[PDB]
């Protein structure tokens, strides 16, 4: 919900970028530019350890920014492709629920707050875990389930 922006390299949508708190971010592994010309022209800060590009939202989008929260209890979270199970300190879905090319999708809690952004997934047995980034209030951390494939 207003956390959806298109990125094009061949003219098609390759990844998603959003508005949260006081900043815009997008995964840095998605090729292309933001659909909104106002956001694509900004100066982005780019980090490969977390694979992310970020900038500051202009003032006039104060109504567009969504809430965020670091607290993340055990249980179910919601996103565009159904729902995800976060347990044991790790996000998972069942095997084959995700497909490549959908990266950039944020994960929301029951109140609609962003808690993680997916970059990939890896399937073990009947369940596939998610390699995403999340945030202790202090720093942006990345969780990878012993390796995962990029989306």
């Amino acid at each position: 919900n207003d956390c959806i922006f298109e990125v094009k390299h061949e003219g098609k949508v390759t990844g998603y970028a959003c508005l949260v708190g006081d900043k815009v971010m997008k995964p840095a592994h998605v090729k292309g530019t933001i659909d909104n010309a106002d956001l694509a022209k900004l100066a982005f800060k780019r980090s490969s350890k977390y694979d992310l590009e970020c900038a500051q939202i202009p003032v006039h989008m104060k109504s567009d920014a969504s809430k965020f929260t670091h607290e993340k209890p055990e249980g179910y979270y919601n996103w565009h492709h159904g729902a995800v199970q976060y347990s044991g300190g790790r996000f998972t879905i069942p095997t084959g629920a995700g497909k490549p090319g959908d990266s950039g999708r944020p994960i929301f809690d029951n109140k609609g707050r962003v808690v993680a952004i997916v970059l990939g997934g890896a399937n073990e047995g009947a369940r596939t875990a998610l390699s995403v980034v999340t945030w202790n209030k202090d720093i942006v951390t990345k969780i990878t389930p012993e390796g995962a494939e990029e989306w």
Partner: protein
């Protein structure tokens, strides 16, 4: 060669090109370390070849080379501070995942 007897003092003449003359003298297999600050002469040209050898690239500089040591130590300390900060940051980033 010198003539020596009892407890006394002896005078020797020497020549050098070093600004700070730090050397050792052997007399009857006994070594003494002599040190001095030398001053340049006022006569520009002489009619006889130099009795001392030229100074090379190792036995160089004067006693006031401590400026070189001080500047090298200061720059090395700055470099060490920068390298220590870089090492700390790299260790933090490697430990963090």
């Amino acid at each position: 060669e010198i003539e020596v007897e009892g407890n006394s003092q002896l005078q020797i003449s020497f020549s050098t090109a070093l600004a700070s003359a730090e050397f050792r003298v052997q007399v009857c297999s006994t070594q003494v370390h002599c040190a001095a600050e030398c001053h340049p002469p006022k006569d520009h040209i002489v009619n006889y070849p130099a009795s001392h050898t030229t100074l090379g690239v190792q036995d160089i500089s004067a006693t006031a080379m401590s400026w070189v040591q001080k500047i090298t130590g200061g720059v090395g300390l700055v470099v060490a501070v920068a390298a220590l900060i870089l090492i700390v940051v790299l260790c933090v980033s490697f430990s963090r995942h």
